Design a protein around this ligand. Structure first.
Ligand SMILES: [N]S(=O)(=O)[C]C1234B567B89%10B%11%12%13B85%14B%1158B%12%11%15B%139%12B%1061B%12%112C5%153B%14874
Ligand SMILES: [Zn+2]
Length: 257
């Protein structure tokens, strides 16, 4: 294999992963006028002070920064969630140009990119078990628009030349993901899925309303990555986003008025 191209992209994924046509697929369009403010939703608790980043990896579909998830060091709680969710990794989706790249949309607006911080529910013990449960994962989604640089992203940007092609990884210690967060933790939430194969319907989505700004130079560096492995014909890693999927009567809830 799956990818993002004509012959292996999102419109093909259902053949290997029939849940692609399921009842709670992601991403979705967030219709801001229809999302209901839910005064019972709690503030989101993001505790990243003790995060331990390990590696940065080009997996042929994105790049990811991986964390030590063997203890409760970087956890998401509160908001719509019951219990504690450990940060495993973050990665991005982005476009070939600034007018596309996000997976979620807001009133049909596409952002230039979308950051996903993937967490798993500690009551299932490991991520592989969590992916088999309807409340197994919590993904914090953050939109990126192009304007001013995000200083906390620069450390990531600057090592991407060392992981150009599928396969490649590098040490990436002491990275603080707090530097990627917007001011506000106001959010929308809904029950959904992974947005890449296996498309498992295991995710509570928490999508922040406030985008972060990144510079054109920062996103340009994303666009120099390659989908291909070294030695294979060069295919820029761009447009690695799944389009919005049918909502199927799910309710999107807002934490804010
Ligand atoms: N856009 S997404 O659904 O967060 C991608 C991932 B992260 B890892 B494993 B974890 B699960 B599979 B692998 B990357 B693909 C799915 B989730
Ligand atoms: Zn993702």
């Amino acid at each position: 294999h799956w990818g993002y191209g004509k012959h292996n992209g999102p419109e093909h994924w259902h053949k290997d992963f029939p849940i692609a046509k399921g009842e709670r697929q992601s991403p979705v369009d967030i219709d801001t006028h229809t999302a209901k403010y839910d005064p019972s939703l709690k503030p989101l608790s993001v505790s990243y002070d003790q995060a331990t980043s390990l590696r940065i990896l080009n997996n042929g579909h994105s790049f990811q920064v991986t964390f030590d998830d063997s203890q409760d060091k970087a956890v998401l709680k509160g908001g719509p969630l019951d219990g504690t969710y450990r940060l495993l990794q973050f990665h991005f989706h982005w476009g070939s140009l600034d007018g596309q790249g996000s997976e979620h949309t807001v009133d049909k607006k596409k952002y230039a990119a979308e950051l996903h911080l993937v967490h798993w529910n500690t009551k299932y013990g490991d991520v592989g078990k969590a992916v088999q449960q309807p409340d197994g994962l919590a993904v914090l989604g953050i939109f990126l628009k192009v304007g001013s640089a995000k200083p906390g992203l620069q450390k990531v940007v600057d090592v991407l030349d060392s992981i150009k092609t599928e396969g490649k990884s590098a040490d990436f210690t002491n990275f603080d993901p707090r530097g990627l967060l917007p001011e506000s933790l106001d959010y929308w939430t809904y029950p959904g899925s992974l947005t890449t194969p296996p498309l498992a319907e295991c995710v509570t989505w928490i999508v922040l309303k406030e985008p972060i700004s990144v510079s054109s130079e920062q996103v340009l560096k994303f666009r120099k990555l390659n989908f291909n492995g070294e030695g294979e014909p060069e295919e820029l890693m761009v447009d690695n986003w799944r389009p919005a999927q049918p909502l199927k009567n799910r309710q999107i809830k807002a934490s804010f008025k």
